[PDB]
């Protein structure tokens, strides 16, 4: 199927409690494979998936240096942002970035990403053309001006179309037994009386990978969008995910309800009933 590689950067200021913390994690699809934390005893990029362990010392040295440099760059960015918003030195602020590439089954680029947020709000993003920026406000326009003057987008484009895609392809090959394996959900329906006159039907999906899934309830073949309770898809801790969807049904009417499950690992979409 299709795949993605994404890096996530976070820097968090903490006035009076040292310099801003900087972290990075990297993912292929829903698999975290590398991490860095400036607060670690000896900050280094560290492997978090077995298939990345085979990368040599040169890889780990380069990756660590990138993150050490980023720690300093992000501290400068945080200082600049505080000024752009006329903010006091006393408050704590957060800067986030996500960047990377999506590829299809043939490994060809579908699109690239390079986005930032300040205090959880979108700040600036590289457009899909990989040549221009969208700035959220007059502060981000300052960043945009600096980055246009420095032709940053051109560097992003070169990375996203080249290095990003090529290393994702390499990782998919090295990790093929897991990264290219979709695990279907194990499914069942449970029944929970609420009172004498109604009960909850809960449709469960367990043990699936990747996280993307569609669970729905129908009554008499009609989607029950408004009346369905969904929980957020949640990690099991063994790489897989879980989700459930529930409806409240009148006693005796259970056979009118069907649960529908779609997932990449299923040979066929499932219909289930109590």
């Amino acid at each position: 199927g299709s795949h993605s590689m994404r890096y996530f950067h976070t820097a968090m200021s903490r006035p009076g409690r040292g310099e801003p913390r900087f972290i990075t994690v990297g993912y292929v699809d829903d698999t975290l494979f590398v991490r860095f934390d400036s607060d670690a005893t000896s900050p280094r990029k560290e492997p978090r998936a077995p298939w990345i362990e085979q990368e040599g010392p040169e890889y780990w040295d380069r990756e660590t240096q990138i993150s050490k440099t980023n720690t300093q760059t992000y501290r400068e960015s945080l200082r600049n942002l505080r000024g752009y918003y006329n903010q006091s030195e006393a408050g704590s602020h957060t800067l986030q970035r996500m960047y990377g590439c999506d590829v299809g089954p043939d490994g060809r680029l579908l699109r690239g990403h390079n986005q930032y947020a300040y205090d959880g709000k979108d700040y600036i993003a590289l457009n899909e053309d990989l040549r221009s920026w969208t700035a959220a406000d007059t502060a981000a326009q300052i960043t945009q001006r600096k980055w246009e003057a420095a032709r940053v987008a051109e560097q992003d484009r070169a990375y996203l179309e080249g290095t990003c895609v090529e290393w994702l392809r390499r990782y998919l090959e090295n990790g093929k037994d897991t990264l290219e394996r979709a695990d279907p959900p194990k499914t069942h329906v449970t029944h929970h009386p609420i009172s004498d006159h109604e009960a909850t039907l809960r449709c469960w999906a367990l043990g699936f990978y990747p996280a993307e899934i569609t669970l729905t309830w129908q009554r008499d073949g009609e989607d029950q969008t408004q009346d369905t309770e969904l929980v957020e898809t949640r990690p099991a801790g063994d790489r897989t995910f879980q989700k459930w969807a529930a409806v409240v049904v009148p006693s005796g009417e259970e056979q009118r309800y069907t649960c529908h499950v779609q997932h990449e690992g299923l040979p066929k979409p499932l219909t289930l009933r109590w």
């Binding site: 990075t24 930032y116 960043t143 290095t163």
Partner: peptide, 8 residues
């Protein structure tokens, strides 16, 4: 692999 400074 990460992308190889430009502060905001």
């Amino acid at each position: 692999a990460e992308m190889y400074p430009s502060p905001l």
